[PDB]
Amino acid sequence: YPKDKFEKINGTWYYFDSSGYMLADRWRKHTDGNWYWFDNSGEMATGWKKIADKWYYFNEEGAMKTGWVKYKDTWYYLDAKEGAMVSNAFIQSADGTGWYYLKPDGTLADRPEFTVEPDGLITVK
Amino acid sequence: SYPKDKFEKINGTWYYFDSSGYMLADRWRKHTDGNWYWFDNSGEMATGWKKIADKWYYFNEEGAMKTGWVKYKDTWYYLDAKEGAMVSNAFIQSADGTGWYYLKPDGTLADRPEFTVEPDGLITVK
Ligand SMILES: C[C@@H]1COc2c(N3CCN(C)CC3)c(F)cc3c(=O)c(C(=O)O)cn1c23
């Protein structure tokens, strides 16, 4: 029935490339510049979804988010470029004044603690 | 016979002429030795530290660009693993994932990096 467009079936959204085949386990750069993903059943991704070992975050419209994003009073940072969540890493502040540290589980360290070894190796908790 | 396919040492500095005899100038070159080289506007081969297109690089006495950690004048620096460009004002992971190393804006390693943490969690490194 559908073709080359988002299609809502039984309360769920799917996408049918310009040939009548619904995308399953497939990313797609929509005509709106946003990125969408469809799981094995063709369903449009919504919310935090893990795809190929990398975590992503889609809003309620199914559009992938990038950059800082708040999720239940806690921040995360999805690669401004690729969208994949960053973890155990330092992200430079917007005004290049400093850095924010993302714990190994994606969450922002509101209060990161450092300890410097004699050679300068920085360990964070 | 004009020079072709070789590094030519002309009274003083080093140069390189490709197979058609062109003198490489203001451009890189990946030699048959797996090394990258760079030449002046005058085609002189690069030695030591060179700033090329707003990025720093380090070549050995022989012109070969270096990558990774290099100690220069008793202080450590970190050249990109592939790119080779000198990293600065950034944190590099140690080879064993244990922690990190901070490279100052001037490229040098930080012995005693000083930390400051804002209320929201913003980190400042002196
Ligand atoms: C595709 C590549 C790879 O290598 C290059 C380089 N560099 C090669 C050396 N590395 C360390 C930095 C990139 C460059 F600076 C400019 C050009 C460049 O200008 C060019 C071109 O065709 O015009 C082609 N090449 C170029």
PDB file of C-alpha atoms and ligand atoms in Angstrom:
ATOM      1  CA  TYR A   1       0.000   0.000   0.000  1.00  0.00           C
ATOM      2  CA  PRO A   2       2.601   2.607   1.140  1.00  0.00           C
ATOM      3  CA  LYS A   3       5.612   3.840  -0.837  1.00  0.00           C
ATOM      4  CA  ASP A   4       8.514   6.231  -0.236  1.00  0.00           C
ATOM      5  CA  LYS A   5       7.259   7.695   3.032  1.00  0.00           C
ATOM      6  CA  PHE A   6       6.659   7.166   6.720  1.00  0.00           C
ATOM      7  CA  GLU A   7       3.639   4.975   7.276  1.00  0.00           C
ATOM      8  CA  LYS A   8       1.767   4.451  10.531  1.00  0.00           C
ATOM      9  CA  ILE A   9       0.531   0.867  10.848  1.00  0.00           C
ATOM     10  CA  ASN A  10      -1.567  -0.198  13.830  1.00  0.00           C
ATOM     11  CA  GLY A  11      -0.352   2.714  15.953  1.00  0.00           C
ATOM     12  CA  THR A  12       3.298   2.193  14.983  1.00  0.00           C
ATOM     13  CA  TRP A  13       5.391   3.993  12.371  1.00  0.00           C
ATOM     14  CA  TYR A  14       7.382   2.342   9.610  1.00  0.00           C
ATOM     15  CA  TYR A  15       9.147   3.556   6.487  1.00  0.00           C
ATOM     16  CA  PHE A  16       8.849   2.193   2.948  1.00  0.00           C
ATOM     17  CA  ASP A  17      11.680   3.195   0.628  1.00  0.00           C
ATOM     18  CA  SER A  18      10.707   4.541  -2.789  1.00  0.00           C
ATOM     19  CA  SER A  19       9.969   0.984  -3.943  1.00  0.00           C
ATOM     20  CA  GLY A  20       7.438  -0.365  -1.447  1.00  0.00           C
ATOM     21  CA  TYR A  21       9.790  -2.172   0.914  1.00  0.00           C
ATOM     22  CA  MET A  22       9.750  -1.292   4.588  1.00  0.00           C
ATOM     23  CA  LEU A  23      13.082  -0.628   6.215  1.00  0.00           C
ATOM     24  CA  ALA A  24      14.061  -3.136   8.920  1.00  0.00           C
ATOM     25  CA  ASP A  25      17.335  -2.854  10.849  1.00  0.00           C
ATOM     26  CA  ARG A  26      18.221   0.133   8.647  1.00  0.00           C
ATOM     27  CA  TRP A  27      19.210   3.795   9.156  1.00  0.00           C
ATOM     28  CA  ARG A  28      17.876   6.475   6.819  1.00  0.00           C
ATOM     29  CA  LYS A  29      18.758  10.113   6.322  1.00  0.00           C
ATOM     30  CA  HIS A  30      15.258  11.468   5.828  1.00  0.00           C
ATOM     31  CA  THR A  31      14.464  14.324   3.457  1.00  0.00           C
ATOM     32  CA  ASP A  32      14.481  16.607   6.528  1.00  0.00           C
ATOM     33  CA  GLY A  33      18.157  16.233   7.381  1.00  0.00           C
ATOM     34  CA  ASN A  34      17.391  14.126  10.458  1.00  0.00           C
ATOM     35  CA  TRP A  35      18.353  10.507  11.008  1.00  0.00           C
ATOM     36  CA  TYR A  36      15.860   7.755  11.736  1.00  0.00           C
ATOM     37  CA  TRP A  37      16.316   4.084  12.588  1.00  0.00           C
ATOM     38  CA  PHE A  38      14.041   1.098  12.212  1.00  0.00           C
ATOM     39  CA  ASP A  39      14.393  -2.060  14.255  1.00  0.00           C
ATOM     40  CA  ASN A  40      14.056  -5.683  13.028  1.00  0.00           C
ATOM     41  CA  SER A  41      10.290  -5.381  12.907  1.00  0.00           C
ATOM     42  CA  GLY A  42      10.375  -2.178  10.886  1.00  0.00           C
ATOM     43  CA  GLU A  43       9.346  -0.027  13.856  1.00  0.00           C
ATOM     44  CA  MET A  44      10.658   3.554  13.954  1.00  0.00           C
ATOM     45  CA  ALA A  45      13.114   4.138  16.785  1.00  0.00           C
ATOM     46  CA  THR A  46      12.026   6.366  19.658  1.00  0.00           C
ATOM     47  CA  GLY A  47      13.942   7.135  22.859  1.00  0.00           C
ATOM     48  CA  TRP A  48      17.321   5.664  23.866  1.00  0.00           C
ATOM     49  CA  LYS A  49      18.149   2.737  21.586  1.00  0.00           C
ATOM     50  CA  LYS A  50      21.322   0.623  21.352  1.00  0.00           C
ATOM     51  CA  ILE A  51      22.287  -0.091  17.747  1.00  0.00           C
ATOM     52  CA  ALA A  52      25.479  -2.056  17.017  1.00  0.00           C
ATOM     53  CA  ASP A  53      27.050  -1.599  20.464  1.00  0.00           C
ATOM     54  CA  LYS A  54      26.552   2.179  20.354  1.00  0.00           C
ATOM     55  CA  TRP A  55      23.805   4.051  22.201  1.00  0.00           C
ATOM     56  CA  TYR A  56      21.620   6.626  20.463  1.00  0.00           C
ATOM     57  CA  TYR A  57      18.735   8.829  21.440  1.00  0.00           C
ATOM     58  CA  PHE A  58      15.701   9.547  19.311  1.00  0.00           C
ATOM     59  CA  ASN A  59      12.960  12.033  20.208  1.00  0.00           C
ATOM     60  CA  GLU A  60       9.257  11.168  20.047  1.00  0.00           C
ATOM     61  CA  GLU A  61       9.213  11.952  16.320  1.00  0.00           C
ATOM     62  CA  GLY A  62      11.912   9.362  15.706  1.00  0.00           C
ATOM     63  CA  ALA A  63      14.598  11.931  14.858  1.00  0.00           C
ATOM     64  CA  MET A  64      18.081  11.178  16.204  1.00  0.00           C
ATOM     65  CA  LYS A  65      19.470  13.706  18.688  1.00  0.00           C
ATOM     66  CA  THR A  66      23.074  14.980  18.808  1.00  0.00           C
ATOM     67  CA  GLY A  67      25.006  17.061  21.309  1.00  0.00           C
ATOM     68  CA  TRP A  68      24.031  17.594  24.916  1.00  0.00           C
ATOM     69  CA  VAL A  69      20.713  16.061  25.878  1.00  0.00           C
ATOM     70  CA  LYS A  70      19.008  15.869  29.261  1.00  0.00           C
ATOM     71  CA  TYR A  71      17.237  12.649  30.228  1.00  0.00           C
ATOM     72  CA  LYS A  72      15.449  12.628  33.589  1.00  0.00           C
ATOM     73  CA  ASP A  73      17.554  15.275  35.336  1.00  0.00           C
ATOM     74  CA  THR A  74      20.859  13.891  34.044  1.00  0.00           C
ATOM     75  CA  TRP A  75      22.947  14.886  31.026  1.00  0.00           C
ATOM     76  CA  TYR A  76      24.526  12.833  28.268  1.00  0.00           C
ATOM     77  CA  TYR A  77      26.406  13.819  25.125  1.00  0.00           C
ATOM     78  CA  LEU A  78      25.704  12.213  21.773  1.00  0.00           C
ATOM     79  CA  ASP A  79      28.408  12.853  19.200  1.00  0.00           C
ATOM     80  CA  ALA A  80      27.499  16.179  17.574  1.00  0.00           C
ATOM     81  CA  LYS A  81      28.568  14.422  14.393  1.00  0.00           C
ATOM     82  CA  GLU A  82      27.684  10.703  14.564  1.00  0.00           C
ATOM     83  CA  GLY A  83      25.081  10.865  17.341  1.00  0.00           C
ATOM     84  CA  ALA A  84      26.486   7.908  19.281  1.00  0.00           C
ATOM     85  CA  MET A  85      26.678   8.463  23.039  1.00  0.00           C
ATOM     86  CA  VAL A  86      30.093   9.383  24.459  1.00  0.00           C
ATOM     87  CA  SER A  87      31.328   7.748  27.664  1.00  0.00           C
ATOM     88  CA  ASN A  88      34.505   7.871  29.797  1.00  0.00           C
ATOM     89  CA  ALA A  89      35.538  10.999  27.930  1.00  0.00           C
ATOM     90  CA  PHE A  90      36.175  14.739  28.298  1.00  0.00           C
ATOM     91  CA  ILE A  91      34.071  17.089  26.150  1.00  0.00           C
ATOM     92  CA  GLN A  92      35.224  20.711  25.773  1.00  0.00           C
ATOM     93  CA  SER A  93      32.723  23.348  26.896  1.00  0.00           C
ATOM     94  CA  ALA A  94      30.941  25.347  24.160  1.00  0.00           C
ATOM     95  CA  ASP A  95      32.876  28.526  24.947  1.00  0.00           C
ATOM     96  CA  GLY A  96      36.086  26.513  24.889  1.00  0.00           C
ATOM     97  CA  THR A  97      36.700  27.518  28.494  1.00  0.00           C
ATOM     98  CA  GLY A  98      36.942  24.011  29.923  1.00  0.00           C
ATOM     99  CA  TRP A  99      35.743  20.415  29.944  1.00  0.00           C
ATOM    100  CA  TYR A 100      32.919  18.168  31.079  1.00  0.00           C
ATOM    101  CA  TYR A 101      33.559  14.540  31.943  1.00  0.00           C
ATOM    102  CA  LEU A 102      31.196  11.790  30.932  1.00  0.00           C
ATOM    103  CA  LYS A 103      31.352   8.745  33.185  1.00  0.00           C
ATOM    104  CA  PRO A 104      31.786   5.282  31.558  1.00  0.00           C
ATOM    105  CA  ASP A 105      27.987   4.907  31.629  1.00  0.00           C
ATOM    106  CA  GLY A 106      27.254   8.046  29.637  1.00  0.00           C
ATOM    107  CA  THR A 107      26.219  10.247  32.591  1.00  0.00           C
ATOM    108  CA  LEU A 108      27.809  13.631  33.252  1.00  0.00           C
ATOM    109  CA  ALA A 109      30.062  13.931  36.292  1.00  0.00           C
ATOM    110  CA  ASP A 110      28.570  16.836  38.259  1.00  0.00           C
ATOM    111  CA  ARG A 111      31.504  16.440  40.628  1.00  0.00           C
ATOM    112  CA  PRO A 112      34.491  14.558  39.073  1.00  0.00           C
ATOM    113  CA  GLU A 113      37.489  13.724  41.265  1.00  0.00           C
ATOM    114  CA  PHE A 114      41.036  13.475  39.933  1.00  0.00           C
ATOM    115  CA  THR A 115      44.306  12.032  41.256  1.00  0.00           C
ATOM    116  CA  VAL A 116      47.608  12.676  39.493  1.00  0.00           C
ATOM    117  CA  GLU A 117      50.429  10.125  39.408  1.00  0.00           C
ATOM    118  CA  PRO A 118      54.080  11.203  39.407  1.00  0.00           C
ATOM    119  CA  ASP A 119      54.263  10.936  35.603  1.00  0.00           C
ATOM    120  CA  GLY A 120      51.124  12.998  35.120  1.00  0.00           C
ATOM    121  CA  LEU A 121      48.617  10.212  34.472  1.00  0.00           C
ATOM    122  CA  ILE A 122      45.098  11.463  35.318  1.00  0.00           C
ATOM    123  CA  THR A 123      42.647   8.963  36.841  1.00  0.00           C
ATOM    124  CA  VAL A 124      39.014   9.989  37.279  1.00  0.00           C
ATOM    125  CA  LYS A 125      36.068   8.800  39.345  1.00  0.00           C
TER     126      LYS A 125
ATOM    127  CA  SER B   1      70.446  14.035 -16.875  1.00  0.00           C
ATOM    128  CA  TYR B   2      67.926  16.010 -14.817  1.00  0.00           C
ATOM    129  CA  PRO B   3      66.806  14.365 -11.514  1.00  0.00           C
ATOM    130  CA  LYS B   4      63.758  12.048 -11.422  1.00  0.00           C
ATOM    131  CA  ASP B   5      62.283   9.623  -8.856  1.00  0.00           C
ATOM    132  CA  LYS B   6      64.762  10.637  -6.138  1.00  0.00           C
ATOM    133  CA  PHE B   7      65.780  12.791  -3.203  1.00  0.00           C
ATOM    134  CA  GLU B   8      68.472  15.104  -4.535  1.00  0.00           C
ATOM    135  CA  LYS B   9      71.016  16.763  -2.262  1.00  0.00           C
ATOM    136  CA  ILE B  10      71.792  20.011  -4.098  1.00  0.00           C
ATOM    137  CA  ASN B  11      74.654  22.005  -2.596  1.00  0.00           C
ATOM    138  CA  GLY B  12      73.134  22.294   0.846  1.00  0.00           C
ATOM    139  CA  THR B  13      69.533  21.173   1.383  1.00  0.00           C
ATOM    140  CA  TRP B  14      67.441  18.134   0.394  1.00  0.00           C
ATOM    141  CA  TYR B  15      64.752  17.956  -2.276  1.00  0.00           C
ATOM    142  CA  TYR B  16      62.676  15.429  -4.166  1.00  0.00           C
ATOM    143  CA  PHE B  17      61.913  15.092  -7.856  1.00  0.00           C
ATOM    144  CA  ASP B  18      59.154  12.716  -8.941  1.00  0.00           C
ATOM    145  CA  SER B  19      59.329  10.356 -11.932  1.00  0.00           C
ATOM    146  CA  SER B  20      58.641  13.134 -14.450  1.00  0.00           C
ATOM    147  CA  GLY B  21      61.343  15.266 -12.888  1.00  0.00           C
ATOM    148  CA  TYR B  22      59.072  17.735 -11.074  1.00  0.00           C
ATOM    149  CA  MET B  23      60.393  19.308  -7.901  1.00  0.00           C
ATOM    150  CA  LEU B  24      57.927  18.762  -5.072  1.00  0.00           C
ATOM    151  CA  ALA B  25      57.184  22.047  -3.289  1.00  0.00           C
ATOM    152  CA  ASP B  26      54.622  23.063  -0.657  1.00  0.00           C
ATOM    153  CA  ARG B  27      53.089  19.590  -0.503  1.00  0.00           C
ATOM    154  CA  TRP B  28      53.428  16.276   1.325  1.00  0.00           C
ATOM    155  CA  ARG B  29      54.938  13.026   0.107  1.00  0.00           C
ATOM    156  CA  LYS B  30      54.598   9.442   1.277  1.00  0.00           C
ATOM    157  CA  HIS B  31      57.861   7.843   0.222  1.00  0.00           C
ATOM    158  CA  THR B  32      58.402   4.199  -0.667  1.00  0.00           C
ATOM    159  CA  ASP B  33      59.730   3.787   2.859  1.00  0.00           C
ATOM    160  CA  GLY B  34      56.304   4.314   4.403  1.00  0.00           C
ATOM    161  CA  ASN B  35      57.297   7.734   5.628  1.00  0.00           C
ATOM    162  CA  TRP B  36      55.698  11.108   4.985  1.00  0.00           C
ATOM    163  CA  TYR B  37      57.859  14.070   4.071  1.00  0.00           C
ATOM    164  CA  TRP B  38      57.108  17.742   3.403  1.00  0.00           C
ATOM    165  CA  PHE B  39      58.825  20.362   1.265  1.00  0.00           C
ATOM    166  CA  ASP B  40      59.203  24.167   1.464  1.00  0.00           C
ATOM    167  CA  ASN B  41      57.819  26.708  -0.999  1.00  0.00           C
ATOM    168  CA  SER B  42      61.348  26.244  -2.327  1.00  0.00           C
ATOM    169  CA  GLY B  43      60.955  22.475  -2.121  1.00  0.00           C
ATOM    170  CA  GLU B  44      63.364  22.052   0.784  1.00  0.00           C
ATOM    171  CA  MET B  45      62.667  18.903   2.771  1.00  0.00           C
ATOM    172  CA  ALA B  46      61.263  19.452   6.246  1.00  0.00           C
ATOM    173  CA  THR B  47      63.338  18.860   9.383  1.00  0.00           C
ATOM    174  CA  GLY B  48      62.332  19.207  13.040  1.00  0.00           C
ATOM    175  CA  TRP B  49      59.166  21.063  13.966  1.00  0.00           C
ATOM    176  CA  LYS B  50      57.234  22.570  11.080  1.00  0.00           C
ATOM    177  CA  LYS B  51      53.903  24.342  11.112  1.00  0.00           C
ATOM    178  CA  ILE B  52      52.075  23.334   7.953  1.00  0.00           C
ATOM    179  CA  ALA B  53      48.627  24.781   7.263  1.00  0.00           C
ATOM    180  CA  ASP B  54      48.082  25.909  10.873  1.00  0.00           C
ATOM    181  CA  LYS B  55      49.102  22.521  12.339  1.00  0.00           C
ATOM    182  CA  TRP B  56      52.370  21.403  13.914  1.00  0.00           C
ATOM    183  CA  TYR B  57      54.368  18.321  12.957  1.00  0.00           C
ATOM    184  CA  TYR B  58      57.763  16.863  13.848  1.00  0.00           C
ATOM    185  CA  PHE B  59      60.177  15.322  11.369  1.00  0.00           C
ATOM    186  CA  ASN B  60      63.356  13.437  12.313  1.00  0.00           C
ATOM    187  CA  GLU B  61      66.856  14.400  11.129  1.00  0.00           C
ATOM    188  CA  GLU B  62      66.025  12.490   7.960  1.00  0.00           C
ATOM    189  CA  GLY B  63      62.746  14.168   7.027  1.00  0.00           C
ATOM    190  CA  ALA B  64      60.421  11.411   8.224  1.00  0.00           C
ATOM    191  CA  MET B  65      57.335  12.749  10.029  1.00  0.00           C
ATOM    192  CA  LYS B  66      56.797  11.224  13.467  1.00  0.00           C
ATOM    193  CA  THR B  67      53.608  10.036  15.198  1.00  0.00           C
ATOM    194  CA  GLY B  68      52.606   9.335  18.775  1.00  0.00           C
ATOM    195  CA  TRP B  69      54.689  10.296  21.788  1.00  0.00           C
ATOM    196  CA  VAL B  70      57.996  12.050  21.191  1.00  0.00           C
ATOM    197  CA  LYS B  71      60.241  13.533  23.866  1.00  0.00           C
ATOM    198  CA  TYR B  72      61.703  16.827  22.701  1.00  0.00           C
ATOM    199  CA  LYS B  73      64.298  18.665  24.768  1.00  0.00           C
ATOM    200  CA  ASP B  74      63.352  16.587  27.834  1.00  0.00           C
ATOM    201  CA  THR B  75      59.619  17.324  27.601  1.00  0.00           C
ATOM    202  CA  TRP B  76      56.934  15.061  26.114  1.00  0.00           C
ATOM    203  CA  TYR B  77      54.647  15.840  23.173  1.00  0.00           C
ATOM    204  CA  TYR B  78      51.941  13.844  21.396  1.00  0.00           C
ATOM    205  CA  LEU B  79      51.697  13.763  17.602  1.00  0.00           C
ATOM    206  CA  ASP B  80      48.497  12.272  16.143  1.00  0.00           C
ATOM    207  CA  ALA B  81      48.735   8.503  15.567  1.00  0.00           C
ATOM    208  CA  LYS B  82      47.753   8.766  11.905  1.00  0.00           C
ATOM    209  CA  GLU B  83      47.586  12.477  11.101  1.00  0.00           C
ATOM    210  CA  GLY B  84      50.792  13.327  12.944  1.00  0.00           C
ATOM    211  CA  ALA B  85      49.627  16.845  13.836  1.00  0.00           C
ATOM    212  CA  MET B  86      50.696  17.964  17.317  1.00  0.00           C
ATOM    213  CA  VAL B  87      47.881  17.598  19.842  1.00  0.00           C
ATOM    214  CA  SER B  88      47.322  20.482  22.266  1.00  0.00           C
ATOM    215  CA  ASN B  89      44.804  21.456  24.955  1.00  0.00           C
ATOM    216  CA  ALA B  90      43.379  17.948  24.927  1.00  0.00           C
ATOM    217  CA  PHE B  91      43.380  14.714  26.961  1.00  0.00           C
ATOM    218  CA  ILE B  92      45.009  11.588  25.529  1.00  0.00           C
ATOM    219  CA  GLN B  93      44.258   8.103  26.932  1.00  0.00           C
ATOM    220  CA  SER B  94      47.258   6.240  28.327  1.00  0.00           C
ATOM    221  CA  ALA B  95      48.264   3.122  26.379  1.00  0.00           C
ATOM    222  CA  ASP B  96      46.604   0.891  29.019  1.00  0.00           C
ATOM    223  CA  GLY B  97      43.301   2.717  29.456  1.00  0.00           C
ATOM    224  CA  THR B  98      44.159   3.463  33.112  1.00  0.00           C
ATOM    225  CA  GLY B  99      43.747   7.234  32.869  1.00  0.00           C
ATOM    226  CA  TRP B 100      44.693  10.258  30.789  1.00  0.00           C
ATOM    227  CA  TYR B 101      47.430  12.736  29.904  1.00  0.00           C
ATOM    228  CA  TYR B 102      46.873  16.432  29.391  1.00  0.00           C
ATOM    229  CA  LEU B 103      48.639  18.323  26.665  1.00  0.00           C
ATOM    230  CA  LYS B 104      48.888  22.049  27.181  1.00  0.00           C
ATOM    231  CA  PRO B 105      47.919  24.630  24.572  1.00  0.00           C
ATOM    232  CA  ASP B 106      51.615  24.784  23.597  1.00  0.00           C
ATOM    233  CA  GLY B 107      51.670  21.033  23.054  1.00  0.00           C
ATOM    234  CA  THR B 108      53.800  20.053  26.048  1.00  0.00           C
ATOM    235  CA  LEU B 109      52.867  17.353  28.569  1.00  0.00           C
ATOM    236  CA  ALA B 110      51.553  18.455  31.956  1.00  0.00           C
ATOM    237  CA  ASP B 111      53.547  17.109  34.917  1.00  0.00           C
ATOM    238  CA  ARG B 112      51.303  18.509  37.636  1.00  0.00           C
ATOM    239  CA  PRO B 113      48.032  19.383  35.874  1.00  0.00           C
ATOM    240  CA  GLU B 114      46.003  21.669  38.160  1.00  0.00           C
ATOM    241  CA  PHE B 115      42.256  20.987  38.391  1.00  0.00           C
ATOM    242  CA  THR B 116      39.298  23.247  39.097  1.00  0.00           C
ATOM    243  CA  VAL B 117      35.678  22.052  39.146  1.00  0.00           C
ATOM    244  CA  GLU B 118      32.719  24.430  38.743  1.00  0.00           C
ATOM    245  CA  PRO B 119      29.289  23.812  40.342  1.00  0.00           C
ATOM    246  CA  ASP B 120      27.731  22.249  37.224  1.00  0.00           C
ATOM    247  CA  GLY B 121      30.802  20.060  36.777  1.00  0.00           C
ATOM    248  CA  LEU B 122      32.844  22.222  34.375  1.00  0.00           C
ATOM    249  CA  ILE B 123      36.539  21.284  34.504  1.00  0.00           C
ATOM    250  CA  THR B 124      39.357  23.823  34.139  1.00  0.00           C
ATOM    251  CA  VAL B 125      42.982  22.763  33.731  1.00  0.00           C
ATOM    252  CA  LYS B 126      45.812  25.128  34.600  1.00  0.00           C
TER     253      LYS B 126
HETATM  254  C1  LIG C   1      44.131  12.924  -0.879  1.00  0.00           C
HETATM  255  C2  LIG C   1      45.463  13.439  -0.271  1.00  0.00           C
HETATM  256  C3  LIG C   1      46.155  12.842   1.013  1.00  0.00           C
HETATM  257  O1  LIG C   1      47.293  13.650   1.494  1.00  0.00           O
HETATM  258  C4  LIG C   1      47.195  15.061   1.437  1.00  0.00           C
HETATM  259  C5  LIG C   1      47.608  15.929   2.517  1.00  0.00           C
HETATM  260  N1  LIG C   1      48.185  15.460   3.775  1.00  0.00           N
HETATM  261  C6  LIG C   1      48.994  14.229   3.685  1.00  0.00           C
HETATM  262  C7  LIG C   1      49.848  14.096   4.979  1.00  0.00           C
HETATM  263  N2  LIG C   1      48.941  14.068   6.140  1.00  0.00           N
HETATM  264  C8  LIG C   1      49.748  13.958   7.369  1.00  0.00           C
HETATM  265  C9  LIG C   1      48.057  15.261   6.208  1.00  0.00           C
HETATM  266  C10 LIG C   1      47.224  15.350   4.888  1.00  0.00           C
HETATM  267  C11 LIG C   1      47.449  17.360   2.348  1.00  0.00           C
HETATM  268  F1  LIG C   1      47.814  18.191   3.308  1.00  0.00           F
HETATM  269  C12 LIG C   1      46.894  17.892   1.135  1.00  0.00           C
HETATM  270  C13 LIG C   1      46.499  17.009   0.086  1.00  0.00           C
HETATM  271  C14 LIG C   1      45.902  17.494  -1.233  1.00  0.00           C
HETATM  272  O2  LIG C   1      45.739  18.702  -1.444  1.00  0.00           O
HETATM  273  C15 LIG C   1      45.522  16.454  -2.251  1.00  0.00           C
HETATM  274  C16 LIG C   1      44.930  16.803  -3.581  1.00  0.00           C
HETATM  275  O3  LIG C   1      44.637  15.925  -4.386  1.00  0.00           O
HETATM  276  O4  LIG C   1      44.729  17.973  -3.897  1.00  0.00           O
HETATM  277  C17 LIG C   1      45.737  15.142  -1.929  1.00  0.00           C
HETATM  278  N3  LIG C   1      46.283  14.629  -0.780  1.00  0.00           N
HETATM  279  C18 LIG C   1      46.652  15.585   0.240  1.00  0.00           C
END
